[model samples]
Target chain A: GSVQIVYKPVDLSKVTSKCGSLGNIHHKPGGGQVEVKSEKLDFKDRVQSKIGSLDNITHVPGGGNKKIETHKLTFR
Target chain B: GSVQIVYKPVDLSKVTSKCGSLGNIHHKPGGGQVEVKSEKLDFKDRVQSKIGSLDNITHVPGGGNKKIETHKLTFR
Candidate 1:
């Protein structure tokens, strides 16, 4: 079992349909993406692994998220 | 203050120079990239923000990391 956290680019069309207008979005500087962090259950295929919501965490890239992105860029 | 975490594609050339051969890399399924998670200090420009070492965490995309990336892809 392990904690996984990943971020990627967001597609605006999907967001608009599910979350209403951009104004409804809460996080600042989301960078049009989301973060998915959670605990995993082992599966031989890995791809077939089960994702439990117990420790699941997801959010837009707020100010804090941006900071992380910046640091990542700097380290590169 | 904020905790930021971001991931990006790894530039193989840079990794080769700093850590010798790919075998020297410890994390499995690193996906050829790194993660930067840390606390940030405020700066007016945002871009000029100062990053603090305290609470700072960096690592390769181990198995856990891959889960996150995979989930991220699913969301997209």
Candidate 2:
């Protein structure tokens, strides 16, 4: 009915055995990268909805932790 | 080169004071929301890549924790 769901920039440290295995962890300057995938549109919608709003984003300052900023996204 | 990174659905309890400043906290039916911003495309690409897959996404389950569904998304 809708597009499939996929996640990236997974945190290996946060990975749990119950859900699934942790994928690759790409550590760069600003932050790192991970991914997740699913066929359920609901899952993708929920995540995307939450991500769509700028007010919902977070960042870890000074610790080299990941930070997010909109305005740079290119439509798939 | 890639895209700017922006993070939404930030966990306030998990945020550190050092990361600039904690933005607004919106309590929804499921989970709360937060946001982060960056000028670097690598940062955006990394975060987007990680978010591209569903497997990388994690949920607390029950207790009103947020669960993401991808079907509701309307691409910009």
Candidate 3:
């Protein structure tokens, strides 16, 4: 069991996203400061609207194809 | 420099949210294996539709308050 805590700097630019497009993928946000570590954990700071998978296979704006419902955040 | 990555488990229930409500906060997704550690870096795996902040002061359906655009994921 090991856990460290240092989440002392926060500004996701007021939680990101100025406009919206998830089907064709368009949203940009930036960040700073965070630290969480664990061996076996249960940490809940909740809020989510997620759908993102595009390893390759994208064409938008001028063409067609690219609709797997793309919007993302990841941790492993 | 410390960046260890073992992101070999993925199933966010096909990107969560069986219904839709972000202003009132109702979406639940479960998880499995994840491993990532860092010490000053730049990593980009992009997808996002985000707004989340609800530590308390929630009254929905028949009440007021609770609108800071709640949807969440955090790492720093």
Candidate 4:
């Protein structure tokens, strides 16, 4: 069974290139919470260097992409 | 309204480290289709070079993440 949990309010300002790319993020309606999570293979240096620390962002469970047309991994 | 599109069957093997890292993809139940996708910030070279072509993964429309705990982008 799939679980649907609506995310609570959060800040979008701190998110930078380190967290993800500009286009990948999509702000959902109904309160503007995004359901997208950073994939492991994404480039990690940009934000890491800017913050002067390493990444602590957690990967979300059960959500990644396989395009409808190709049905293959959309590994960004 | 939140749309729940149950993905059809797909092959997971063609998906290499290039498409994404090992952990990000999650196979959901009922049909074992993975809902996870590659993020934009994810490194592109590995997959690009391997396929002898270029990245063609389409970014998903409405699903992106802002951690419930941090409320910030996990730009992986």
Against the true structure, whose lDDT is highest? 2
lDDT for B20 (candidate 3): 22
- Per-residue lDDT, model 1, residue A39, is 40
**lDDT per residue as tens, model 2, A1-76:** 3444332332222211122222222222232333333333332322323322212222222233333333332346
For candidate 1, write residues A53-72 as lDDT tens digits: 11212222111111112222
Model 4 CA lDDT for position A49: 14
In Å, residue A58's CA in model 2 sits off its true spot by 26
User: What CAPRI-style quality would you assign to candidate 1?
Assistant: incorrect
Off by over 4 Å in 1: A1-43, A56-58, A62-76, B1-76
For model 1 the local lDDT of residue B59 reads: 31
lDDT string, candidate 4, B1-76, tens digits = 4433333332222221122232232222221111223444444332321211111222332223332221222211
State the RMSD for candidate 2: 23.1
- What is the C-alpha lDDT profile of model 1 across B6-43, one tens digit per residue? 55443221111112111222211211222234333222
TM-score of each: 0.13, 0.14, 0.14, 0.13
Better of 1 and 4 by lDDT: 4
